[PDB]
A paper describes a structure:
M. rotundifolia is a wild North American grape species closely related to the cultivated grapevine species Vitis vinifera, and RPV1 confers resistance to the oomycete Plasmopara viticola, the casual agent of downy mildew in cultivated grapevines. The RPV1 gene from M. rotundifolia encodes a TIR-NB-LRR protein that confers resistance to the oomycte pathogen P. viticola. The multi-domain architecture of plant NLRs generally involves a C-terminal leucine-rich repeat (LRR) domain, a central nucleotide-binding (NB) domain and either a coiled-coil (CC) domain or Toll-interleukin receptor (TIR) domain at the N-terminus. Toll-interleukin receptor domains are protein scaffolds that regulate pathogen defense-related pathways in plants and animals through TIR:TIR domain interactions.
Residue numbers in the entry:
A (entry chain B): 22 to 188
B (entry chain A): 22 to 192
Write the structure that this text describes.
Amino acid sequence: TTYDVFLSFRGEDTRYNFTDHLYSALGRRGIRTFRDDRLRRGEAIAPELLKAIEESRSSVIVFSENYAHSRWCLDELVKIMECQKDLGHAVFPIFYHVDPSHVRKQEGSFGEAFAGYEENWKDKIPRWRTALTEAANLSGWHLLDDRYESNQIKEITNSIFRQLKCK
Amino acid sequence: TTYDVFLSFRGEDTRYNFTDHLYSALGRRGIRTFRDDRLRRGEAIAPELLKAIEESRSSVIVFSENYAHSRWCLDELVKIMECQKDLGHAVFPIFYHVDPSHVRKQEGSFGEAFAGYEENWKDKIPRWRTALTEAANLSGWHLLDDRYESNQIKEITNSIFRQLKCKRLDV
């Protein structure tokens, strides 16, 4: 493998702030992290991203309000969960100012997302919901905005350090 | 002195996110920083805070959208600038997603703040306006969004480290 962690996130929500601080915190701890910063286009997710997932020991998912509003994010998650079943791929979900149960049940913003998918992407929805529901039933961290964010990140990155580095 | 840096910020804007990440970054560089996290009440600014500024080698000001909407922030800033004239207090302003000239000239959100001060705090406005205007003419960093924030922070704290270490070595 190439990376200790693959960072899956919604750029529109958290690219330049939370996920960047998280990315940087991971590196300071010697946790090699892939955080996509390339310009990308096309309807289908980039092969380079699917490969990076496969070459990562684990993924960190930054679930944010509009994460499911991105098809690339969802496809990402389907791939990540495949690696979870088939490889030894560890998965650490972060619920960033979103109710974990909304992700599990696709309610709230996540529900609005899938509503938009009904007419043109109906066949991919099943694998998407399943991957979404599976990831969200894993033990992760529910983060609120009422707390010091660097302490939230330190807690997250220490727990990942313990699981990936201490062996 | 007791601290290398006194962190002045508007809690409501940046307490739990940016200023916190800044705070933590400063600590990592061995920059002893005072960042107020106590419960405080009462109309007048806490004496512990004014003392803290006097016992700090410098202040970092996180100017944010609603900074001037807090009299405590403004009274804070006046003290900071006074220590700057009378003591050897260094001052590093960060313009966090706000236009430096809005601060300097009290336009935009900063102008709106002062409108509200007109009726009950008219007499304090002059030294407040002076402290904002002076502080904003110190060389600092204007931070926009759409930029990687941890890098913005690394850049700021690297510069502050070099400047505080050079100040100390020249003395």
